[PDB]
Design a protein around this ligand. Sequence first.
Ligand SMILES: [Cl-]
Ligand SMILES: [Cl-]
Lengths: 287, 300, 300, 287
Amino acid sequence: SMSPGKLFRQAVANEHPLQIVGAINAYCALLAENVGFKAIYLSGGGVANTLGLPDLGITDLHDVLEDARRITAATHLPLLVDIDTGFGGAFTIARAIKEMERAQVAAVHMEDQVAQKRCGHRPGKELVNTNEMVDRIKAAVDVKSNDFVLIARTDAYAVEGLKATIDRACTYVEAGADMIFAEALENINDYPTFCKAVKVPVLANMTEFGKTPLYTAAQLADHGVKMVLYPRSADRAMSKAALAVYEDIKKHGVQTASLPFMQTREALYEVLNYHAYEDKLNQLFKR
Amino acid sequence: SGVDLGTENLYFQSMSPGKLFRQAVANEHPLQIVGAINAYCALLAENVGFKAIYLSGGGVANTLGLPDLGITDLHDVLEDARRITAATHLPLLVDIDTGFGGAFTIARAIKEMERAQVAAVHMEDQVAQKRCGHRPGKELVNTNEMVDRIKAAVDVKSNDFVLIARTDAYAVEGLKATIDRACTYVEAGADMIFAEALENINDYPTFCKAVKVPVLANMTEFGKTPLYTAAQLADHGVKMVLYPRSADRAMSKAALAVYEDIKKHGVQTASLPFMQTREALYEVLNYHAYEDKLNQLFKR
Amino acid sequence: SGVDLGTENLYFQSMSPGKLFRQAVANEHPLQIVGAINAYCALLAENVGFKAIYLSGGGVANTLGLPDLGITDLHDVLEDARRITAATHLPLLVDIDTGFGGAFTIARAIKEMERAQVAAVHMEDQVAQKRCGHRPGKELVNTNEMVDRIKAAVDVKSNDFVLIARTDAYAVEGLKATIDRACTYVEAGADMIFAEALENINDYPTFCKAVKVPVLANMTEFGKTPLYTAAQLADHGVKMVLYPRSADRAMSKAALAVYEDIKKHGVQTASLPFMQTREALYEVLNYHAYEDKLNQLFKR
Amino acid sequence: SMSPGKLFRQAVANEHPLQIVGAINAYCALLAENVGFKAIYLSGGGVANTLGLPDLGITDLHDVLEDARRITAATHLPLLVDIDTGFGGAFTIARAIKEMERAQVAAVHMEDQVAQKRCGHRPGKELVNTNEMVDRIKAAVDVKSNDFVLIARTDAYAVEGLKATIDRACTYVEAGADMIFAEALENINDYPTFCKAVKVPVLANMTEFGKTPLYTAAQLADHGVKMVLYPRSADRAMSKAALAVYEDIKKHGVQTASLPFMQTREALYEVLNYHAYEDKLNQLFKR
Ligand SMILES: [Cl-]
Ligand SMILES: [Cl-]
């Protein structure tokens, strides 16, 4: 039938561009589905921050895997998962790929940042040599099914400029990476060059409050981008909404003022497809 | 042991989660308890200055994309509880439904919630032992069955850990029958009582004086029950007020809105005013304290 | 798609876990299924050349230090199943007790076992809906209740995935009542049938021909039931023979012995002859293939 | 009352020496308890191998934590847990300590091996500089309760000889490590020197089939050792027993020959304390 990795490859192809929305949990995935998104995303920083932790590589394969499993249990919508640098050496990478496949994950992204750091080493954005990242990619490709999508993420644009970035990316593709992930380029007219040089489908990361700008989906597609990621958008809005409710309750002693801002029970039941549970019991049993 | 108040070394007893909950219930008037579906939410609640937090059973299920039909088990709720208590020492109350099975399952639930550093649980008098194809229902077990559940829990619990008996009987059997069950639950060893928000706030003094132990009023939305202020409920002898799903419902509407924006406009520009700032995020995560810790302990 | 047999490209269909189990049941006469409590045991079983493996419900509980009293839930067994299927593609049959709850819990159990790459489950006709303080018992549910459980499972299962209906009725209701239940279970959509080892091997031809679907005989130790050889059981129309706890019981006696040795002699010298060699361990773990993989893919 | 870490400190003191047995799972812990051991151990290699994985640092905090939780749920006997090199930098170490405490673990051991290695780096026994390990220890000590025991394991004897090993160990103690873990020394008369130099309670690792020898508990105690670890002893015997049963069933078509080698149902019920469950239901209910 349709394998997760296939569904992702297909979505990447038939969408122009493919919009991929972050969802921090299964219910958010169901909202995204209901709105008609074709692919969803589990953000690494999202996993950490939702646990109340900074995005400093404290989390491991199990933290991400559990959140991924929760999502894929609720939806068949193809899921892309941030695996950071792969959580360790060759065999850990291999374990990550195999477990993500077992969890019905469609795609992962893995990046060219350094991991191997002294105990007390400060938060940084340092790149590994091209060869080290090649090794990472080989480790993953060795175990992956054909369908399953490995996205190589480079963080080198910010540090090494467009040319060095195209050079890394191309080497990553020949090491077996299926697709490429780069931050949103500083100039949308850098994109046609970047995309035609790497040939494989390219992902532009539309973060908020970062160094990088926002462009529209149409705009990015017209400049040769095939995937556009919104890694934390919903999450940031959820947090503002929650904080507002808490502040309301604390200040007013009741949640009256917040009621207009709440999803209705009726809408919640519809997203959960509650009726289909009732109908299932009527369809199968009696009494 | 002793802690300094300024320069003065005075007695101070370190408190266990369950003690911190008992103390919060005492020093607050009334104690407001807010639902948080995850650790980040718990930190927001902490930041606003709530003294207790809550892990909703329906919240656990719905967040997994499941209806609140008793599908989830000890492990589902325990994992979400562990995630929260890892991030905060703020006393956490956890919904354990009917206890997930018979006497030894209840015992396991109590013990594991204690090990997860949970302060309190609530367990309710709904029927569990339903035929395979039984339709969703609000049936109560007889008072004796619930007594047995409470005995199972009390048998294993530490002294400090709080067991809250929840009755769902008000809606179906009225005030008197509800007071009767609750009183029996207290004598079976329930530390506190949990009931829906009564339809008439002037039924509360009667209810509270009859059961004597601290009473929780459940401030749900979009249900049958009304809303009152915390002050109002405290004036009628209520000692805890729970907001089980409030934040979650708002989070869902906000997420949906962002999704709809991105889908319709092909960019999230319109959504930016409605997003928490990265700076606020960093502050709630206490990011700076991580940087300072590395400077405090190491070189370079 | 096509696979080479030597130089010749021929048709070959990749098989799903549940297919591999169906195929094993077909090409083996009979299929021996061995219990393994963990992934290492599963690899030992594989190394000896078993074609299927088993995750025992009582094994899951007892390994956690718990009696087999229905305390454990979907998550306990699922985690142990996941650990095994991570290590081996050998088709795994998993005990799901009564399904851990009503219709949607059963459905969840089936779906999660499929996602964990499990080939088959067994689900049984024991009572689940017991009062809080109910004593350990071997009560059966009526045939209709079990039919409902099976319908719940079949509703969600893939075609290949195997649902085995286990009856515990032989011991309490005799051969006829047992055949009656089993036949009803097959028509409710059970793929295969699981019964205790019959007290008389000459009751098997009757039992097997009446239920038509592949039958499993449970070769327990220290129970009421006898032992027969695999050949013997196959000659009487049995297609699966299960050894649910055999290895585990031996492992426990061995562990205890080592502990006793160390305690009594202050060193493990006497135990060394009874230990697997490090070299054997390395071979079962296929350690060399890790070294070769690094040489195959990288430099230095 | 009695905190796990306290119970471990106390056992280390009042036993001469303290024998610590590996138990791979809760049932094994209960056997060890029944035999009268005072402390138990969760081996890192045991965790990996039981998962069907080589001891190559593929496992993470979650793998070990889950197995630890399972054991501590069943027994209050103080548990020492192998945390390898701590599964990452400063904050991962801190997470490991805090989670082990929450799991009711009494002690951990952390070692001075290198972790930070290229993707395809081969299995090795290379040491980090003394300073790197100091950093690791500081990270752990920063978060640990007073009671909870941090054991610094050095693997330097084999590579750097006795003197360099004493030098590392002493620095580890002053970095805040509560106790020291070394392989079994090649000569039991190296021990008095080693133990008096480091002052803190010392652990000798009694592995089988290794480079290092076996000595008796009495022998090691007389040479100034306060803990003796049997990391895999029971596990190796369990594996031989299991394999024999499998071979029996496969060859003979029945498990008859293996029955003499099985724990009886009666003994199993006693270890599980089954009777106390029956008595509890009679003590609390009726009918
Ligand atoms: Cl003073
Ligand atoms: Cl050919």
